[PDB]
Motif scaffolding. Structure first.
Motif, PDB file in Angstrom:
ATOM      1  N   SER A  33       1.021  -1.179  -0.304  1.00 22.38           N
ATOM      2  CA  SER A  33       0.391  -0.245   0.017  1.00 22.38           C
ATOM      3  C   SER A  33       0.810   0.834   0.151  1.00 22.38           C
ATOM      4  CB  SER A  33      -0.988  -0.025   1.232  1.00 22.38           C
ATOM      5  OG  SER A  33      -1.067   1.575   1.524  1.00 22.38           O
ATOM      6  N   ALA A  35       0.787   5.233   0.927  1.00 23.04           N
ATOM      7  CA  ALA A  35       0.200   6.414   1.147  1.00 23.04           C
ATOM      8  C   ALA A  35       0.813   7.637   0.933  1.00 23.04           C
ATOM      9  CB  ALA A  35      -0.970   6.159   2.780  1.00 23.04           C
ATOM     10  N   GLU A  38      -1.426  14.205   3.809  1.00 22.19           N
ATOM     11  CA  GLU A  38      -2.247  15.407   3.809  1.00 22.19           C
ATOM     12  C   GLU A  38      -2.194  16.847   4.282  1.00 22.19           C
ATOM     13  OE1 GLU A  38      -3.096  12.443   5.017  1.00 22.19           O
ATOM     14  OE2 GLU A  38      -4.119  11.507   3.256  1.00 22.19           O
ATOM     15  N   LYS A  57       5.917  10.831   1.415  1.00 21.44           N
ATOM     16  CA  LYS A  57       4.989   9.255   1.524  1.00 21.44           C
ATOM     17  C   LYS A  57       5.595   8.205   2.425  1.00 21.44           C
ATOM     18  CE  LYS A  57       5.723   9.495  -2.632  1.00 21.44           C
ATOM     19  NZ  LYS A  57       6.210   9.124  -4.602  1.00 21.44           N
TER      20      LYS A  57
ATOM     21  N   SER B 201      -3.447  12.169  -6.168  1.00 22.45           N
ATOM     22  CA  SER B 201      -3.213  12.566  -4.657  1.00 22.45           C
ATOM     23  C   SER B 201      -2.875  10.722  -5.079  1.00 22.45           C
ATOM     24  CB  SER B 201      -4.420  12.356  -3.715  1.00 22.45           C
ATOM     25  OG  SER B 201      -4.208  12.488  -2.648  1.00 22.45           O
ATOM     26  N   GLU B 203      -2.558   6.922  -2.755  1.00 24.14           N
ATOM     27  CA  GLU B 203      -3.030   6.337  -2.525  1.00 24.14           C
ATOM     28  C   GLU B 203      -3.359   5.409  -2.666  1.00 24.14           C
ATOM     29  OE1 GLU B 203      -5.008   9.637  -2.596  1.00 24.14           O
ATOM     30  OE2 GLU B 203      -3.686  10.606  -1.495  1.00 24.14           O
ATOM     31  N   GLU B 205      -3.958   0.742  -3.315  1.00 21.95           N
ATOM     32  CA  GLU B 205      -4.273   0.140  -2.294  1.00 21.95           C
ATOM     33  C   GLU B 205      -4.627  -1.359  -3.542  1.00 21.95           C
ATOM     34  OE1 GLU B 205      -5.610   2.907  -1.310  1.00 21.95           O
ATOM     35  OE2 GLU B 205      -6.539   2.127  -2.559  1.00 21.95           O
ATOM     36  N   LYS B 219      -6.700   8.336  -6.620  1.00 20.98           N
ATOM     37  CA  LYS B 219      -7.741   8.906  -5.815  1.00 20.98           C
ATOM     38  C   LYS B 219      -7.211  10.874  -6.442  1.00 20.98           C
ATOM     39  CE  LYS B 219      -9.908   9.669  -2.881  1.00 20.98           C
ATOM     40  NZ  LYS B 219     -11.649   9.779  -2.389  1.00 20.98           N
TER      41      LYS B 219
END
Lengths: 241, 241, 241, 241, 241, 178, 207, 146, 157, 48
Positions: A33, A35, A38, A57, B201, B203, B205, B219
């Motif tokens: 994953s 992410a 923000e 990140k 953005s 993100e 998965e 996203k």
């Protein structure tokens, strides 16, 4: 070119310490994953959002295998494994019958203590003997009664321990999956994803549930490499090439 | 007019930097969400008149498509995808037999050290020689036994990596679906959802699990336009023209 | 009496600034939640609470409808519906065959530009041609090659612009449901829930996926009435009227 | 001997303010949980836990019945029930035909303005007329058309109000479940769980859309008893006494 | 050696103070987990440093059971069991005498029988009604509806109390499971898990649903040994030696 | 026109990658079935219905042969066919095949043949030919070989609409032999 | 009093969109399969009590005809017959370029022929129907007819099926003139006026 | 090409045995599948890959002690106590038709067997044992012809 | 074959007669696990390994069919008959007292099948029309003796 | 009509002596299940 996958990739691990390579075995489920943090920039008349700002990140790892052994249980706890060590384990003995002399013979090699439990639930504590014949109290049990015993025994095997202080080493992770052709369904290409400069994290959880395997999962954490400013690379192949 | 709709929606992306209106794709699931926040001014015996105030309305974008696309990976990490590169990738050779002379050969061409794993399981490191065959100690394995070998091979394909560099450029996104008549069911009015300014953005998965597609998720984050100051635009029109 | 409900909740919407009574629809699902929060003051030895409290209450409202309406979307924000207006939307063309003269004929009305995509994913851009025929270099595609195009087409229809600066007005919501007796299998009573002086809140999310409806949601915030100091009223009727 | 329980518990609440032993109803589930809060204290080198000030031992309660009752919500918010209260509620009328003279008769008893809607949609608010016949504009619709009427009428029933104040009533919860002997196949014991000095907190939540698992949820909070300091108590009651 | 496990593992419990060997039983689930936390961003051009703090490493235990044991909840909340203690409980009866007499003669126990009930929606409250085998309660007529009755019953049995009494018992936990050779379908090895110096927690959650098993759940925390600084030990061996 | 028509069929197989037109002979029994799916929206007051939402249209292929042919199991699993291979049986050399964990990576075409007469004069009337879009293999083969009973190989298949013409089946009543 | 039926049932299908009543039936067999679906909510405490809930009834019909016609496929998905339309064909020869003729090189391998046992194309145009995945239903009505012979005729029974909704289940085997017996599937729903799905009507010859 | 059988298939066993004549021999294969849901109906087919289940049904011309014991006064000492199915073996077929040989690498002897004691009829209904894929060559079944 | 039954609770030799068909078909309740690389199959497991017995005869006895249901035979019982009263043997049907244990042995021509600790089952089926042809079928369940843990043994004389 | 029934019924069948005393079969409360199938044939008797 345009393709998808529907198969679980294979896993390969390399120890970055000196030269070791780990876990060249098939796994059942893999994941990773990505992410980022923000934030937001604000200003102007009416507090209009004039710009978007976000950075830092971080990428996580996930792998699931349908098989279990301590070799990869030591993945999250990096240490050597000692073999053929003397350990003490428990033992459960059933089907104990007492003779008419109000004495019970024992079959086994008790180490510390021998405990007796009657059929109704009451527990009896007796000293450990050598011959194995124990005079059961008459109130606890009479002649021709079914008894059970529990006692610690000694065994030799490979043991692994968890130290109070923690320890981890950088590793290498490799993936391997094959793509499928959009219309003729042939294997168009293979996909490999490499994660240099990564380390595991300790979040192990084994469920000792019945009717199915626990399927151990190992959790790793990605880290940015300091050499060429990259920490996640995905490579696709070409079966023609 | 009052209708019931259900369908997917083709989604287009147009970079703000250049005229890159590529990805006229047929996605699987698209959705958007909006939320507002209150910064009201309340208190005790004083400050009670709060004088209602409005701010902080944000637009979220979710795009799910049943296919996989490498340029979709290039979408949110702004980076040119170099092609025709030289990358070394790991691979496993399976089913190797050992002769009486204990000298095994490899079909592939290793570029690094070769490791053999036996039935019992041991790690051995050897060098690369031009003869194409390699010896094995008798203690490692007896003759006429099966072996598994693992080594890396240089392979050719497209390359892309993830660095410590964030996204780039803003894009133009727009939805397009259809509406069905309540009592005279037929495609009644196309619904167009426009966005004057959106930003990528990060993100991610993907669970590449066997038996199901990876189903990538991207996203997007929208922002106000300098001239019109718009969040989104909704278009609907019948087919009498 | 112990009663069981079996149906949905009827929704009635009224705006405080006027006498409008829109959305008398039957909806699909209605729900509401309530939470309590408070803080206390600490003291001396033992950090026992001083039993001086500041308590507040809030209630969230949730509704779900199986249908879609444009004014239902506009209900969230403080903006009006714009009628038939010229707008620009994208469009695509599929199944284009290029003649031996490296030209293609178009049956559309381009306003900005026309771009051609080939089977190999190559992209070409060319301005709009008055005669509807475009010149394509032989490098992009040879004669009798399939092609697809994407452009923009002007449209006329009613318009909606979601704004992040305007929000006002107050509303009131009423509920209605039937109650079933567990013995006679007949409607014993009916329950209505009223929320006078409920402030609309912007938390909007709808899912446009393959199959099944969209089911849009709107959340609400309830404030105590300035006169009666109430936010909700629960009334149980009876079939004795 | 041991036992296994598969049945729920009959739920009783007795108010502590007065001798009110009520709610002798059967529910479909019941549960309670116990948790502790740790704060610890940083130590040093990494063996941080040295001494812990553990306190605030709390126990939560949960119960969900299979029936709805206006009585089973007053414990959530301290208030009474007002009976025979004149309340105004909305209503909807369908199948209203219009004559040639553009007039529609009404069989109800409106107390406010009446809104009429045509086939597609239009708002027509008209003051209440004692004759019951209301004129219809020509632009509204034509003759021999079906219309719908929505207005407000008074009703009489049991009304309850909700506010944020007067939360002081205490209760006493008693459980009752039967225990099954594992190897004789009859009842063995009755298990009763009591929670003296329980304070009803407000976490009201419901979703009324159909008859699928209404489950009116009531959540309680246990607090310290004064003269005994025992938060909860369990009782084993064999059937032989 | 490579192996797979698919079944449960028995639970062995021992006390540090005395020498009891309680709970030589079996369950369906017995899990334990490691908790790791901390780690910081420590950014700068978005780069990622070591990303560690290297502390904590707690161990939590989770053991369920297939039966209900009073000693089990007594053990997680160490206290004294009050054998032969009088307690008070509620009871009900349904139908004793036709109600067209205004005479009710309750039977079984007369202590604290109050608060009768109406049969539809009201509370047929007799208020105080304690009398010696009374047969003349008047209250309201309620001629021939159902009767209904609520009692209070005194009984004896085991008694357990829950309070913050600063539990401090220390324990030893031993596991035992059976492996399986993935080649010859035989139990290759027996794996044991040692958890010396383990203390009980205060987490007690359970539910009483319509039809299920109780499966009681309590948690344990393992602390590092004062001598070896160990809290988790993994040991396994094959039955060939 | 109105007539009864049922017998053994002749079905070809056209591979998209290369010009393969195998099975140019008779078959024991060839037939196919069609079953459409249901759907209901429901909702509103109680559980009243609102919409239907018509759904997919599936086609299943049943083909049987009077005898066993190697090419049938060669195309059920699209494995490479090799000749003059040394294998252990003693050792024998000949045509070799095997089934792996990933195969039938191919697409095919299906056609049907028919020669029918009128139900009264019993003279040939027309050749109602059924054409199919690209089909995908569905490997469910059942064999039963005990003692000279029968072979009757069975192969399932799946198909749906095509990329551009979007037709899931083609039926044509033509070839009037008069 | 006493009746026995040993004959096929005649049916009439009328379209409730254009008034087209068609298919004067000379059949061989009929179907009447029916089913009912119910749901129940469980109780609590010990032995769980019972609470009733919604229940439904279903009716299924199947009509088998002696003859076979394209209309038996047309009425399942309402589509106009493309009569006199161009077709694409290719059949054996034990139209050369219009057929994409292929060569047979004996054994089991062959190669293509430059387009300038083989395959040739017929050109008879004729009727054609192309099936597309866009069709919902066409309103119809079903009414049966069966004569009961007295074991002593005794009565004539007609079974009506108002408010029938199409549901297509089709299997075919069409090669030569032995036996086809086309099969149809048809579903019904409750009527909006009298709430009836099927009725049995007895009669007599002396009236 | 053109084939026909006028014989009975032969089964060979080799413990990791049974060189005799059988009566019936058949086996079946089934693979599960799910349909991918595409945009606006179902255009993208993509028949998904799933389990390739292979089951065996073999029965000899007679019933003996060891043939039944394959699944798991003294006289002959045979009984069933617990899991005893595991006995590594190999299956080879022989059917002249070119002779058709079928083998199943990596057999896992299992069984859910039926029986009957009637006033006649026959005995030894069938044996239903399962097989798995090989570790090295990932092969589950092979068809050999000559 | 010939089958005879004996009761461990009380000494009695009954059921000695000739049967028509007999079967003790078992059930393993197996479930197939997963090793995921292209979702390959690996290591199927079984859980129950339980055996269900069948036995039938072409005759009906008042003592027969009384083991599947829990009720004793009542004789000289007054009952109501619709055409009056009749006095004689009778039997009722109940759904309790599932505690009796039997012994099962088949005389096969010599293979002796010893089945200790068999539990009775209430499942029975019939297929008859008007005028006779009953032919009842009896179903039984077998459990391990728990002394030597044997539920099914096969012995040849 | 769709359901709308709760009426109870009683059934009683009989057989004869294939063991002087026939097996008279009385039955307690019988509730209809709602399973009525009567299929027409092409030359066979009609049995409800």
């Amino acid at each position: 070119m345009k393709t998808v996958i529907q198969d679980t990739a294979d896993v390969y691990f390399k120890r970055k310490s000196d030269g070791k390579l780990v876990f060249t075995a098939e796994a059942q489920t893999a994941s990773f994953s990505q992410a980022i943090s923000e934030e937001k920039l604000r200003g102007g008349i009416g507090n209009k959002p004039l710009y978007i700002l976000k950075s830092e990140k971080e990428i996580n790892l996930t792998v699931k295998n349908a098989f279990f052994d301590l070799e990869w249980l030591a993945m999250t706890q990096g240490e050597t494994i000692q073999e053929e060590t003397k350990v003490k384990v428990f033992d459960r003995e059933h089907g104990l019958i007492v003779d008419d002399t109000n004495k019970v013979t024992l079959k086994g090699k008790p180490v510390s203590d021998v405990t007796f439990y009657n059929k109704k639930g009451l527990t009896y504590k007796i000293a450990v003997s050598t011959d194995g014949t124990y005079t059961i109290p008459t109130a606890f049990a009479a002649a021709k009664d079914k008894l059970t015993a529990v006692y610690q025994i000694e065994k030799v095997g490979r043991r692994l321990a968890i130290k109070a202080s923690k320890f981890s080493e950088r590793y290498e992770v490799e993936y391997r999956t094959i793509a499928y052709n959009p219309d003729t369904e042939e294997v168009y290409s293979d996909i490999y994803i490499q994660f240099p400069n990564v380390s595991p994290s300790g979040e192990f959880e084994m469920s000792l549930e019945n009717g199915n395997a626990l399927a151990p999962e190992i959790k790793f954490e990605a880290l940015a490499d300091t050499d060429t400013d990259e920490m996640a690379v995905v490579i696709e192949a070409s079966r023609d090439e």
